[PDB]
Symmetry: C3
Subunit: 65 residues, 3 copies
């Protein structure tokens, strides 16, 4: 859970959401989530919005603190 | 999408929400949303809460940046 | 509504949520909410996440401003 992709996947799943629901609520492409969760995108463009949908601190999501 | 009313309507709709659902989730009057979306209220009282429900940055919502 | 437990209960209910739904969306234990709402826990560990789920300002939730 020390990687961003790991952190987002774990939190998404803790909130009982699908990648699709995450995507809808954050207003980004579902292909954007997969890439983040699959560890491709290290620096997400809409991290803020993603974090808002996951009810967590963006800083925490990006850096793990 | 350069006006606040435009910005809120577009984001609301991107998130597949109705004015009623926006209102419930933000905890404000549904007549408050219509006024904002109809461009009457330029400076919304609960912008923060509205932005939280739309999973976006309040600053972005108010000014467009 | 001048106490945190009062403030959280009132807002939770304004948003038409159950303690269980609050808990799921915030990603904390449902026993964590009851304790806060029952006034036992004065300084909640996940106040931020709780506030995110209630679409409100954490500061407002904790202090009432």
């Amino acid at each position: 859970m020390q990687t961003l992709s790991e952190r987002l996947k774990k939190r998404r799943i803790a909130l009982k959401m699908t990648q699709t629901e995450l995507a809808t609520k954050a207003g980004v492409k579902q292909q954007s989530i997969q890439l983040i969760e699959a560890g491709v995108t290290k620096r997400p463009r809409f991290l803020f919005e993603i974090a808002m949908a996951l009810n967590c601190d963006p800083v925490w999501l990006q850096y793990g603190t």
